[PDB]
Amino acid sequence: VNSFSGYLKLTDNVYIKNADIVEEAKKVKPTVVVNAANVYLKHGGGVAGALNKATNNAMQVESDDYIATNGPLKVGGSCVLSGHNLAKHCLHVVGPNVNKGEDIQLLKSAYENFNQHEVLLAPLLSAGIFGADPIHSLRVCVDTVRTNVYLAVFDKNLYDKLVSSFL
Ligand SMILES: O=C(O)CC[C@H]1CCCN(c2ncnc3[nH]ccc23)C1
């Protein structure tokens, strides 16, 4: 038993809700919140900009030190950093950005990072400003993640289309 509430169950291990991931993180304090990161951990907009704003820019300060030490992530890769006031940990995961021409096949590699964590609150990778089809992203998630994932979908209209079209 865990503290996630109001989710629709899609499969044995994947759940979904119309929610603002920032507000969900603020209430649940999950062990892991996933950020929709880029390779530079520049949290300017989308999910990343919203998560970072909610930390009063502490996420960005920590991220800049991480990059200065380690260099950029790989597309499809991830790193574990602090969850600040939102979660114990933040798993920064880089899905391919279609608006940069990155290979959508890397989306599966991106979701594989979730399997290193027993339970996660997450957005749909490569959705939103990353330019991928969220229905495809959900399919890859279901077919790749084996750990327990709670997906927060900000847009109510999108949430209804994902549910109604789910196979
Ligand atoms: O319609 C969706 O979910 C997909 C849109 C992407 C794009 C970036 C922001 N998107 C979010 N997803 C969940 N929570 C959020 N809070 C603030 C933004 C946010 C995900």
Swiss-Prot record:
Free-text activity regulation comment from the record = Inhibited in vitro by GRL-0617.
The impact of changing T31A is:
In strain: Mu/B.1.621
Q: Where in the cell is it found?
A: Host endoplasmic reticulum membrane
Q: Which reaction does it catalyse?
A: Thiol-dependent hydrolysis of ester, thioester, amide, peptide and isopeptide bonds formed by the C-terminal Gly of ubiquitin (a 76-residue protein attached to proteins as an intracellular targeting signal)
Question: How is this protein positioned relative to the membrane?
Answer: Multi-pass membrane protein
Macro domain boundaries: 1-167
Can you tell which superkingdom this protein's organism belongs to? Viruses
Residues folding into a coiled coil are: none
Q: How does it assemble?
A: May form homohexamers. Interacts with N protein.
Relate the protein's function as given in its record.
Answer: Responsible for the cleavages located at the N-terminus of the replicase polyprotein. Participates together with nsp4 in the assembly of virally-induced cytoplasmic double-membrane vesicles necessary for viral replication. Antagonizes innate immune induction of type I interferon by blocking the phosphorylation, dimerization and subsequent nuclear translocation of host IRF3. Also prevents host NF-kappa-B signaling. In addition, PL-PRO possesses a deubiquitinating/deISGylating activity and processes both 'Lys-48'- and 'Lys-63'-linked polyubiquitin chains from cellular substrates.
The protein depicted here goes by the name Papain-like protease nsp3
Natural source organism: Severe acute respiratory syndrome coronavirus 2
